[PDB]
């Protein structure tokens, strides 16, 4: 699997693959690895699917209770700490989680927190997670800019997932793109990695080995 | 956690008007054929028999539970001999519940159980549960070593549910008795002494004790010499 | 692994902590601050298991802040290091120990003295002129044992730290992405290069 | 074996055989190449080898050695049945310390013209490698006896492509050989 | 796998199922498991197929050479002795479990051999995953005075019990009949009880559904 | 434990113990607050002055509590409020709002009007 | 003590535009033995929801029992309001994850109609992650079944014959009868090639008209 | 397995059950465990069937060589050959052999070769899994120089108890009687010995 | 250990060897293994000495309570209490108990509680390591309604063989005789029973 | 671990190899050349177990030199890589396998073509436009897959190598002390920066 998020002037891009595997068997090509926590928060499933999906939906419930109590949007820092504290309370029980909590608030701006099963809680500009993370970093670090256009940032996300899909057998199926804005996240659709691969291979001329 | 004294196979079969279940009378202690009078068919009322294989101490615990269940069912129930008697399906569901709960507490009753009976509507009941809580029904059921040897023979009689109305009690009992003989030939933990129970929707429970495997064939052994070349 | 280093000089404590965070195959971050301010004149740096370190340090920070609010007073670096030692010594006997090694640098404004305490995850506390955890001491203590002087100024302390870091960068096989340097003195806590 | 991945399928048709393989070379999840052809030929006999790519190469070189010496001594190219026996004996010679491979033989006997496949002489289709069970499902659904070579090509190609799409470790293109006593056509397929 | 042997009044029958499995997958629906050691000496193997094939081939070769050397028809006891000693040398690492049956100048013979090299004689035998079902049939229907036709019926019934009741066994019944003073009668697919029903539709694709990048002729 | 219903309704629907707690407040020493545009001012009218400090207690560096009534009860509320402020700052990533803290303290008081065995 | 076993069995959910199909083989196995030829694994849970929990059959039975009880309780506390398939999926997730640390060792599929009236299939892992899918196979022969359905339902890898791979073969409406035919052929091939795939195929069909049951015999 | 050999006035009788088991499955209910290695030298095998068959074949070969070179082997010589095989291969071979034989000078002799390959000459020997249950009975009931009939009864009773109690023992009771007169094979069926 | 209980015409006799071993060392050569839990209810202990002593003390306590509340317990009731302890603690406790008792209505009864905590009412029971060697002898020699003297002889012979063959058994043979007349303790020394 | 990288461009093969040698806790050397010249136009780089790599590479070098003396001729890079593959494939079956991964860069002066062969310790040989062993490919192949062009000049190849090395230095947690770069072309073998 491959998931990435990066900050830019337009906010945050989230890009993920949709492959799921069981050994060599491709169990599904169409898994949603982004969890829509609420209209303003996204989480990325890269650990065990069940742990991420269950606990980030519960996190959405806690965000809603906080909003009802406090009359305000919860901070991304607060949401990520709620999740990381929960996950740390189950440390050693065998949770399997590796998620970017992505959001954009007025007080914080566009914010990403990496959260791990081990209880790591890192803020950062760029994170790639999953078996394809090194390939995605390779594209993204080569091409990232803060002043990048929204369309260029979406293309860069898609191309980093494509690079992982080419090289990592456990990544692929399709690319799901999200754009987090202050007004909330925007889904930028699903892109089949084979169509995308042969498109980029002709248009960009890359993958000359294939 | 580990079975100590064990019963071996229970075998059973639907027939047109009822169910037959048989089990041998042996408690083995590893390879020692230690206890030879262990009844493993527990009648519950006149409509149900519970055949138990595996650990005899857990079997005795289940038999206690079944007697208690009959006593409790009689409480404040003036129809406990009538339309509110225990059915085979009630006894099975209770046992399967206990077995699965015990499994889920990692403290299994180390048994395989067949509940044979006739429902008040006259339907044959024949269902298996084991120490895992795995349940299934078939026109023939056998536990343990009987699953590998008796089921083929009984299925040659009742291969599908449409064979049940064609199968008389005489044919079914003969098949069960022959299967017991085959088990005595081939199961090193079997006894020639067995119990058999018939549950008929008309003639009720018939419980036959102290049956013996008979008409064994051994005389061909005289001709067997050495292991290859010894004349 | 992480590098945390401390030097107590005449007027101040210098803490130096590595910026890298590594998960599995990749350097995720090159800018991580492995310290928490416990009080205006007390700083703790930490190293150890992922998650444990920050959970522990934030629990300590909250407790010291609560004490300060309740008493309207700042605990000595001695009292803080005793409290942290007690929490670590408990954790060894707990159902899941905090695998966390700390340095506590503080300036005691009653004594007008800098103090540096090293506490391992066992709760082994020792006051030291300079200190390190894990392999950082294996490369740095011979430089400190050779060059350290108790009357060093802050600037001499920083130059000695630079020599220690250069030696680590030469001989230690990991790339720790440099150090953040904090100074604790009578004016409080500041970050330096 | 699975370290490298890969699949081979062969099918018989009407006076024809097809043999097809994926082109991926992996190192566990890392894809190394898409130029690693798994199908070799020795005269008119075709051998597909799945499994450990070092053993695939070693066995190809060994069977080249043996079939060249065969042609020199016998003064004729080896036939598919004889080659199947040769493969069997050569692999069992390492019964202890095996080659970690699945061979698939395909060809047409020069004298009788009978199509032959083995992996035996299971005449309908033969399947090897990581997606073997997907391939069994596909072929057992799609296969029909006495397909003409063009329909055999479509059938084997769809079996390979759809099975490969459900195997993580195989793909990045496929090659299909359609073999007739007079003519062998190689075709490359795109994968998506 | 289900294999059985059955002695009868003037001969011996061996029979087998034809399913070969790779784990839970049927690799071959019609594998021939009855292997000729010599014209009137036949074997059938359970366990790993390659070991059965190889030990049968080696022993058959040596039996043929020994028959030429002695100018005599081979004996079933020779095949037995050679198998036994080979398997014992390999200490059970050759995973061959065999029924060996045949006819020779000394009469009819039926043996089992286990991978460790242990042998026994029998009037009826079964081996493999279906051996318990087959033996249940044999124990309930075998008799000392079997005719040829009764023995063929019994053997195929025992294989059928394996086919219906053991997952590892299926498809067809193969039979070989070795009467004294007669050619061995091999009956490939003596029964075919497992013929697949016709599919609900043909799945022949129209020509051109598959996208081809490029074509080339291969020289051969 | 002791669970007696001490705060209960009278026939006229009053809770006498809460009214008498208000009488305790009314007997207690004054507190005054005046909010301006840019500050809030809190005031009050052989003792050792050093160790009889201001009745105005910080709950956190940004928020301050004064009280009237039973001093000992107020120490309990103040300690709970301080602990909650530090807890919010720990488990979430921000200091408490003044209204959050007020709501927490009012909740503590309310709960002690509806809980067995407590005044 | 191992609290788990494998009982085999294979299941297949297909969502149509106005129907859903949930199919399962009826064989219960233990190792190489048949326990039962007709032990149905696919259940109508009410509210035109069908469910199957393939894997360890005791955990599958327990999960189905608990789901049916959740449906009953939902009716009790919602005035017999119909449970939505989406709400059933969320509830099943909560049932499974409540056992996160001693999981129900089953792959669950539920099928039904969404509130638009379109076919819906949801699939669940043992721990309770779930996804709405067009189709899902589960159990032993899923790898034998689904690629062929991908090929025949979604026309995967099929291109328009004259276009030399430029144009996809266009998706089109399959009737439930066409889907049933494809399901039957897929299970027949899995019966040919997988030893666990049963003696019978039971199909539950959900439509606006309710749940209907079809049964087809498989080999053995 | 339950195997016996008993010396008596005229010679020695070997007895065995006929059950071979693989786990709880009876792989062969009519096994012949009484193996001739020489005309009047026989062995009872217990333990690994492959090891004991291989050993018995090798002993028969060595004793055939001995016979053709040096004349008739004594039972002690056969026991020595068994010993050399069992002892030099004690790590690989799980073989508990009883060797029994007759010659006109020594009469009947019995040698037991337990695991490890010690040799013990005895007036009678019991071995196998079922022998455990009959040690007391045999010690209480054996006596020197029984008649043939008394010895056959003694073996039949002992093995009937060993079969009653040991699941790994059963089937028929086979005996071989070795005397001056010759070699005689006996068989007793369950409906004879289960009445005892 | 070798322990017996045998019902007879007048009641029941319990028998035991006196050897306690720790490995091959005899830690106690004069052990009393016959434990009174009630006036005419006694047990023979085999297996873990700590487990069986703890169980017997708990049973004696429960039966003293039973006696004071409900009157005299039956031997079946004692066996049931033993069962409940052995069965509910079967994972921790390695206890094979023989329970024997007399009452005027049931006469002598014997119950064996093997490992696992099944209960078996029997006319006689044998247990312990040395019982293996005497299964055949006891089956061949037990008969119902023996006299006291015949039963004492039967136990003495059986245990003498169990001592002969089992290294873990030996010392004196202790017996307790339970009848209407009372409780009688017997002891037999090696120079008596080794002559048998 | 060691980094070896190769890029076959239009006119030449570029090999890049990391300079570090690490034993246990310490970087012993920062200047190690992980290559051997097999022939005037064939270069092999190697990575793997300590000792095995150099013993293998020197054995290969001696055998190729012996062939060249015996024939007075230079083997093609193809023939060399086949020979090396055969030696590695043998070693897997030997009593102690050479745990050695190699890249062979050569210029075939009969074809006038650069050739780059990757051979793993199993004896898995593949001709590639660019190649890597271990984790170096995990970070570099996406850059090469994106930017590589078969008609690249040597200078473009070197710039692409610089990008790959910078990416490794950023994300890979070890400090490999940079790379030595060798170019194999029609003029032979030279070392570059």
Q: How far apart are CA C150 and CA I88, in angstroms?
A: 70
Q: Residue B218: which H helix or E strand, with range? A: none
Q: How far apart are CA B205 and CA B195, in angstroms?
A: 13
Residues of I belonging to the active site:
1
Q: How far apart are CA E151 and CA H74, in angstroms?
A: 46
Q: Please name which of H58, H60, H46 lies closest in space to residue H88, comparing C-alpha atoms.
A: H58
Q: Please name which of A3, A2, A6 lies closest in space to residue A180, comparing C-alpha atoms.
A: A6
Q: H35 is written with which tokens?
A: 């193996």
Residue range(s) defining the domain that contains residue H41: 1-196
Q: Residue A15: which H helix or E strand, with range? A: strand A11-17
At residue B190, the 3 state secondary structure works out as: coil
Q: How far apart are CA A11 and CA A5, in angstroms?
A: 10
Mutate to test the interface with A, among G126, G128, G129 (most CBs of A within 10 A): G129
Q: How far apart are CA A180 and CA E165, in angstroms?
A: 60
* CA dihedral angle for residue J17, residue J19, residue J25, residue J26, rounded to 10 degrees: 170
Q: Is residue F53 classed exposed, middle or buried when 0-12, 13-18 and 19+ CB atoms within 10 A define those classes?
A: exposed
Q: Output the CA–CA distances (angstroms, integers) from residue D6 to D21, D132, J126, in the order listed.
A: 7, 10, 15
- Whether the CB-CB separation of G27 and G199 falls below 8 Å is answered with yes
Is G1-220 CATH 3.60.20.10? yes
Cβ neighbours of F61 in C, within 8 Å:
69
Does residue G164 sit at the E interface (CB-CB below 8 Å)?
A: yes
- Whether the CB-CB separation of I46 and I82 falls below 8 Å is answered with no
Cβ neighbours of J128 in A, within 8 Å:
209
Q: How far apart are CA E140 and CA C133, in angstroms?
A: 79
Q: Please name which of E160, E141, E202, E145 lies closest in space to residue E7, comparing C-alpha atoms.
A: E145
- Whether the CB-CB separation of D5 and D139 falls below 8 Å is answered with no
Cβ atoms within 10 A of the Cβ of F24, count? 13
What are the structural domain ranges in chain A? 1-210
Q: Is A136 annotated as a binding residue?
A: no
Q: How far apart are CA B109 and CA B57, in angstroms?
A: 9
Fold of domain A1-210: 3.60.20
Q: How far apart are CA J34 and CA C108, in angstroms?
A: 55
Cβ neighbours of C173 in J, within 8 Å:
20, 22, 25-27, 174-175
Q: Please name which of J129, J120, J128 lies closest in space to residue J91, comparing C-alpha atoms.
A: J120
At residue I135, the 3 state secondary structure works out as: helix
**DSSP, residue by residue, C85-147:** HHHHHHHHHSSS---EEEEEEEEETTTTEEEEEEE-TT--EEE-SEEE-TTHHHHHHHHHHHH
Q: How far apart are CA J19 and CA J33, in angstroms?
A: 6
In this complex, the residue of A141, A167, A208 whose CB is nearest that of residue J167 is A141
Residues of H belonging to the active site:
1
Q: Output the CA–CA distances (angstroms, integers) from residue F114 to C168, F8, F14, F76, in the order listed.
A: 64, 8, 13, 18
Q: What backbone phi and psi angles, to 5 degrees, belong to E127? A: -140, 160
Angle between helices B144-157 and E131-141 (to 10 degrees): 60
Does residue E9 sit at the B interface (CB-CB below 8 Å)?
A: no
Resolution in angstroms, to 1 decimal, for this deposition?
2.2
Contacts of I among chains (3+ CB pairs under 8 A): B, H
Q: Residue H47: which H helix or E strand, with range? A: strand H41-47
Q: Please name which of B191, B172, B128 lies closest in space to residue B14, comparing C-alpha atoms.
A: B172
Per residue in I74-107, is it b (16+ CB within 10 Å) or e — as a string?
bbbbbbbbbbebbbeebeebebbbbbbbbbeeeb
- Whether the CB-CB separation of A164 and A4 falls below 8 Å is answered with no
Q: Output the CA–CA distances (angstroms, integers) from residue G68 to B97, F99, G26, G114, J21, in the order listed.
A: 16, 46, 21, 19, 65
Q: What backbone phi and psi angles, to 5 degrees, belong to E130? A: -90, 5
In Å, how far from its chain's centre is CA D114? Answer: 18
CATH class as words, domain J1-193: alpha beta
* CB within 8 Å of E198: residues ≥ 6 apart: none
Going by their DSSP bridges, the two strands D7-13 and B135-137 should be labelled as: unpaired
Which residues on adjacent β-strands are paired with residue E204? none
Per residue in D151-180, is it b (16+ CB within 10 Å) or e — as a string?
bbbbbbbbbbbbbbbbbbbbbbbbbbbbbe
Q: What backbone phi and psi angles, to 5 degrees, belong to C185? A: -145, -170
Tell me how many degrees the CA angle I93-I94-I95 measures, rounded to the nearest 5.
100
Give, rounded to a whole angstrom, the gap between the first and last alpha carbons of chain F: 15
Q: How far apart are CA I180 and CA E94, in angstroms?
A: 69
Taking one residue from D and the other from G, the number of pairs with CB-CB distance under 8 angstroms is 53
- Whether the CB-CB separation of H18 and H163 falls below 8 Å is answered with no
Q: Please name which of A66, A70, A97, A103 lies closest in space to residue A83, comparing C-alpha atoms.
A: A97
Q: What is the DSSP letter of F69?
A: S
Cβ neighbours of G189 in D, within 8 Å:
137, 140-141
Does residue G168 sit at the E interface (CB-CB below 8 Å)?
A: no
Mutate to test the interface with I, among B6, B33, B60 (most CBs of I within 10 A): B60
In Å, how far from its chain's centre is CA E108? Answer: 18
DSSP count for chain D of H helices, then E strands = 4, 11
Q: I28 is written with which tokens?
A: 């106690």
Q: Output the CA–CA distances (angstroms, integers) from residue B58 to E88, F16, H24, I47, I59, in the order listed.
A: 44, 63, 22, 21, 21
What are the structural domain ranges in chain G? 1-220
Q: B93 is written with which tokens?
A: 């569901």
Task: State which approach was used to obtain the coordinates.
Answer: cryo-EM
Closest residue on chain F to A62 (Cα): F92
What are the structural domain ranges in chain C? 1-193
Q: What backbone phi and psi angles, to 5 degrees, belong to F61? A: -60, -20
Q: Where are the alpha helices (DSSP H) in A144-192?
A: 150-167
H21 to chain B, closest Cα gap in Å: 7
| G residues 90..149 contacting D (CB < 8 A) | 141, 143-148
Q: Please name which of H127, H6, H164, H152 lies closest in space to residue I135, comparing C-alpha atoms.
A: H164
Going by their DSSP bridges, the two strands H124-127 and H120-122 should be labelled as: unpaired
* CA dihedral angle for residue A137, residue A141, residue A144, residue A145, rounded to 10 degrees: 140
A25:D166 CB<8 A:
yes
If one looks up domain B1-231 in CATH, what number appears?
3.60.20.10
Cβ neighbours of A195 in D, within 8 Å:
192
Find the CATH number of the domain harbouring I74. 3.60.20.10
Q: What is the DSSP letter of E166?
A: B
Q: How far apart are CA D112 and CA D125, in angstroms?
A: 20
Tell me how many degrees the CA angle E161-E166-E169 measures, rounded to the nearest 5.
85
F91:A70 CB<8 A:
no
Does residue G207 sit at the E interface (CB-CB below 8 Å)?
A: no
Q: Please name which of C105, C121, C139, C122 lies closest in space to residue C37, comparing C-alpha atoms.
A: C105
Q: What is the DSSP letter of H14?
A: E
In this complex, the residue of H132, H140, H164 whose CB is nearest that of residue I132 is H132
Cβ neighbours of A127 in J, within 8 Å:
none
Q: Where are the alpha helices (DSSP H) in B105-219?
A: 144-157, 169-186
Chain J touches chain C, with at least 3 Cβ pairs below 8 Å, answer: yes
Q: Output the CA–CA distances (angstroms, integers) from residue H99 to C70, G106, H73, J80, in the order listed.
A: 94, 59, 13, 67
Cβ atoms within 10 A of the Cβ of D89, count? 11
Residues of E belonging to the active site:
1
Mutate to test the interface with J, among D57, D62, D172 (most CBs of J within 10 A): D57
E runs forming strands in E9-104? 11-17, 20-22, 25-28, 34-38, 41-47, 96-104
Q: Residue B175: which H helix or E strand, with range? A: helix B169-186
Domains annotated for chain E, with CATH where assigned, are 1-220 (3.60.20.10)
Q: A81 is written with which tokens?
A: 């700490």
Q: How far apart are CA G114 and CA G91, in angstroms?
A: 16
J124 to chain D, closest Cα gap in Å: 5
- Whether the CB-CB separation of E80 and E100 falls below 8 Å is answered with yes
Does residue D68 sit at the J interface (CB-CB below 8 Å)?
A: no
Which residues on adjacent β-strands are paired with residue E175? E15, E187
Per residue in C8-20, is it b (16+ CB within 10 Å) or e — as a string?
bbebbbbbbbbbb
At residue G198, the 3 state secondary structure works out as: coil
> Is the torsion defined by CA of B141, B144, B148, B150 positive or negative?
negative
Q: What is the DSSP letter of J25?
A: T
Give the CB-side neighbour count of residue J118, counting CA atoms within 13 A. 22
Closest residue on chain G to A33 (Cα): G131
Give, rounded to a whole angstrom, the gap between the first and last alpha carbons of chain A: 21
């Amino acid at each position: 699997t491959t998931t990435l998020a990066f900050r830019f002037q337009g906010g945050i891009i989230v890009a993920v693959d949709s492959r799921a595997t069981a050994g060599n068997w491709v169990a599904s090509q169409t898994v949603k690895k982004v969890i829509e926590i609420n209209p303003f928060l996204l989480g990325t499933m890269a650990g065990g699917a069940a742990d991420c999906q269950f606990w980030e939906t519960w996190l959405g419930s806690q965000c809603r209770l906080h909003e009802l109590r406090e009359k305000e949007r919860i901070s991304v820092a607060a949401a990520s700490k709620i999740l990381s504290n929960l996950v740390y309370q189950y440390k050693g029980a065998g949770l399997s989680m590796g998620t970017m909590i992505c959001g954009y608030t007025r007080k914080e701006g566009p914010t990403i927190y990496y959260v791990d099963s081990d209880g790591t809680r890192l803020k950062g500009d760029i994170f790639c997670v999953g078996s394809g993370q090194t390939f995605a970093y390779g594209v993204l670090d080569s091409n990232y800019k803060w002043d990048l256009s929204v369309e260029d940032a979406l293309y860069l996300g898609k191309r980093s997932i494509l690079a992982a899909a080419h090289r990592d057998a456990y990544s692929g199926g399709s690319v799901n793109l999200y754009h987090v804005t202050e007004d909330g996240w925007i889904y930028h659709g699903n892109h089949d990695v084979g169509e995308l691969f042969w498109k980029v291979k002709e248009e960009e001329g890359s993958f000359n080995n294939v | 956690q580990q079975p100590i004294v064990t019963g071996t196979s229970v075998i059973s079969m639907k027939y047109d008007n009822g169910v037959i279940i048989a089990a041998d009378n042996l408690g083995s202690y590893g390879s020692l054929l230690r206890f030879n009078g262990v009844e493993r068919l527990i009648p519950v009322g006149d409509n149900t028999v519970v055949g138990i294989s595996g650990d005899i101490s857990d079997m005795q615990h289940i038999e206690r539970l079944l007697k208690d269940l009959v006593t409790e069912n009689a409480y404040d129930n003036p129809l406990a001999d009538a339309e509110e008697a225990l059915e085979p399906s009630y006894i099975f569901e209770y046992l399967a519940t206990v077995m699965y709960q015990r499994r889920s507490k990692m403290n299994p009753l180390w048994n395989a159980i067949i509940v044979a009976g006739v429902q008040s509507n006259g339907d044959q009941f024949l269902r298996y549960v084991n120490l895992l809580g795995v349940t299934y029904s078939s026109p023939t059921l056998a536990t343990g070593f009987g699953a590998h040897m008796a089921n083929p023979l009984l299925r040659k009689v009742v291969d599908r549910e449409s064979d049940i109305p064609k199968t008389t009690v005489q044919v079914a009992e003969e098949a069960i008795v022959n299967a017991m003989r085959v088990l005595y030939y081939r199961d090193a933990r079997s006894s020639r002494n067995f119990s058999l129970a018939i549950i008929d929707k008309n003639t009720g429970l018939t419980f036959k004790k102290n049956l013996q495997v008979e008409n064994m064939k051994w005389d061909f052994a005289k001709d067997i010499k050495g292991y290859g070349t010894q004349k | 692994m992480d590098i945390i280093l401390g030097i107590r000089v005449q007027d101040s404590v210098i803490l130096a902590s590595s910026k890298a965070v590594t998960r599995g195959i990749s350097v995720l971050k090159d800018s991580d601050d492995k310290t928490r301010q416990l009080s205006p004149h007390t700083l703790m740096s930490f190293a150890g298991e992922a998650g444990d370190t920050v959970q522990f340090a934030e629990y300590i920070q909250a407790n010291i802040q609560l004490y300060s609010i309740r008493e309207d007073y700042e605990l000595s670096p001695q009292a803080v290091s005793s409290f942290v030692r007690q929490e670590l010594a408990k954790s060894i006997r707990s159902r899941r120990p905090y695998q966390v090694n700390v340095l506590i640098g503080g300036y005691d404004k009653k004594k007008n003295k800098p103090e540096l305490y090293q506490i391992d995850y066992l709760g082994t506390k020792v006051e030291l002129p300079y200190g390190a955890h894990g392999y950082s001491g294996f490369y740095t203590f011979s430089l400190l044992d050779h060059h350290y002087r108790p009357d060093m100024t802050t600037e001499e302390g920083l130059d000695l730290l630079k020599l220690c870091v250069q030696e680590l960068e030469k001989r230690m096989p990991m790339d720790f992405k440099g150090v953040i340097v904090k100074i604790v003195d009578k004016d409080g806590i500041r970050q330096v290069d | 074996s699975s370290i490298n991945g890969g699949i081979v399928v062969a099918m018989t048709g009407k006076d024809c055989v097809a043999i097809a393989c994926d082109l991926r070379l992996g190192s566990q999840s890392l894809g190394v190449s898409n130029k690693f052809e798994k199908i070799f030929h020795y005269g008119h006999v075709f051998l597909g080898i799945t499994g450990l790519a070092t053993d695939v190469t070693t066995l190809n070189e060994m069977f080249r050695y043996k079939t060249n010496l065969y042609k020199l001594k016998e003064e004729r190219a080896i036939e598919p049945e004889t080659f199947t026996q040769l493969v069997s004996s050569s692999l069992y010679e390492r019964r202890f310390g095996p080659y970690f491979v699945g061979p698939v033989v395909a060809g047409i006997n020069s004298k009788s013209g009978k199509p032959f496949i083995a992996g035996d002489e299971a005449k309908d289709f033969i399947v090897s490698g990581t997606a073997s069970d997907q391939l069994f499902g596909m072929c057992e659904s799609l296969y029909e006896p006495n397909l003409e070579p063009e329909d055999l090509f479509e059938t084997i190609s769809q079996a390979l492509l759809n099975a490969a799409d459900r195997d993580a470790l195989s793909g990045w293109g496929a090659v299909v050989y359609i073999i007739k006593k007079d003519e062998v056509v190689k075709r490359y397929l795109k994968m998506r | 796998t289900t294999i059985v042997g059955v002695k009868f009044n003037n001969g011996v029958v061996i029979a087998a199922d034809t399913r070969s499995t790779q784990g839970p997958i049927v690799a071959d629906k019609n594998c021939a498991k009855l292997h000729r050691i010599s014209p009137k000496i036949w074997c059938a193997g359970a366990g790993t197929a390659a070991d059965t094939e190889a030990v049968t081939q080696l022993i058959g070769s040596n039996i043929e050479l020994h028959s030429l050397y002695t100018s005599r028809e081979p004996r079933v006891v020779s095949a037995l002795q050679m198998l036994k000693q080979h398997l014992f040398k390999y200490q059970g690492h050759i995973g061959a479990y065999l029924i060996v049956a045949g006819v020779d100048p000394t009469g009819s013979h039926l043996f089992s051999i286990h991978a460790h090299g242990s042998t026994d004689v029998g009037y009826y035998l079964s081996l493999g995953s279906g051996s318990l079902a087959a033996m249940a049939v044999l124990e309930s229907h075998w008799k000392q005075d079997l005719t040829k036709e009764e023995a063929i019926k019994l053997a195929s019934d025992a294989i059928q019990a394996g086919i219906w009741n053991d997952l590892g066994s299926g498809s067809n019944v193969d039979v070989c009949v070795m009467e004294i003073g007669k050619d061995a009668e091999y009956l490939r697919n003596y029964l075919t009880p497992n013929v697949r029903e016709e599919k609900q539709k043909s799945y022949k694709f129209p020509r051109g559904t598959t996208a081809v990048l490029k074509e080339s002729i291969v020289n051969i | 434990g002791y669970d007696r219903a001490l705060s209960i309704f009278s026939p006229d629907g009053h809770i006498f113990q809460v009214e008498y707690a208000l009488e305790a407040v009314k007997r207690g020493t004054c507190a005054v607050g005046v909010k301006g545009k840019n500050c809030v001012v809190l005031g009050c009218e052989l003792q050792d002055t050093r160790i009889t400090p201001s009745k105005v207690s910080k709950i956190d560096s940004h928020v301050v509590l004064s009280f009237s009534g039973l001093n000992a009860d107020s120490r309990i509320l103040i300690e709970k409020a301080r602990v909650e402020a530090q807890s919010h700052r720990l488990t979430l990533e921000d200091p408490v709002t003044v209204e959050y803290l007020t709501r927490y303290v009012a909740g503590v008081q309310q709960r002690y009007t509806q809980s067995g065995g407590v005044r | 003590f191992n609290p788990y076993g494998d009982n085999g069995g294979t299941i297949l959910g297909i969502a149509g535009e106005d129907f859903a199909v949930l199919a399962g083989d009826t064989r219960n196995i233990t190792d190489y033995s048949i326990n039962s030829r007709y032990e149905p694994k696919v259940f109508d849970c009410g509210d035109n929801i069908v469910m199957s929990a393939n894997g360890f059959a005791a955990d599958g039975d327990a999960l189905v029992k608990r789901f049916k009880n959740s449906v009953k309780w939902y009716h009790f506390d919602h005035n017999d309001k119909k449970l939505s398939i989406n709400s059933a999926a969320r509830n099943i997730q909560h049932l499974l994850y409540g056992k996160r640390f001693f999981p129900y060792y089953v792959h669950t599929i539920i099928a039904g109609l969404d509130e638009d009236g379109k076919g819906a299939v949801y699939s669940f892992d043992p721990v309770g992650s779930y996804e709405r899918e067009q189709c899902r196979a589960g159990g032993a022969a899923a790898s034998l079944i689904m690629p062929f359905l991908d090929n025949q339902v979604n026309f995967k890898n099929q291109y328009e014959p004259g276009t030399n791979g430029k144009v996809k073969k266009p998706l089109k409406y399959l009737s439930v009868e066409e889907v049933i035919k494809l399901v039957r052929d897929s299970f027949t091939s899995a019966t040919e090639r997988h030893i666990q795939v049963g003696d019978g195929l039971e199909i539950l069909i959900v439509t606006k008209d309710g749940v209907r049951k079809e049964f087809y015999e498989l080999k053995r | 397995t339950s195997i016996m050999a008993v010396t008596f006035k005229d010679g020695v009788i070997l007895g065995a059950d006929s059950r071979t088991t693989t786990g709880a499955y009876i792989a062969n209910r009519v096994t012949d465990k009484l193996t001739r290695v020489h005309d009047k030298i026989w062995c009872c095998r217990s333990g690994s069937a492959a090891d004991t068959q291989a050993i018995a074949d090798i002993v028969q070969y060595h004793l055939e060589l001995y016979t053709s070179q040096y004349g008739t082997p004594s039972t002690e010589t056969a026991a020595s050959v068994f010993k050399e095989l069992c002892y030099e291969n004690k790590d690989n071979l799980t073989a508990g052999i009883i060797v029994a034989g007759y010659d006109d000078k020594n009469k009947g002799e019995v040698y037991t070769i337990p695991l490890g390959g010690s040799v013990h000459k005895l007036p009678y020997a019991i071995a196998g899994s079922g022998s455990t249950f009959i040690y007391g009975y045999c010690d209480k009931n054996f006596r020197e120089n029984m008649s043939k009939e008394e010895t056959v009864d003694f073996i039949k009773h002992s093995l009937s108890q060993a079969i009653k109690w040991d699941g790994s023992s059963g089937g028929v009771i086979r005996m071989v009687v070795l005397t001056a007169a010759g070699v005689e094979r006996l068989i007793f069926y369950p409906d004879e010995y289960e009445q005892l």
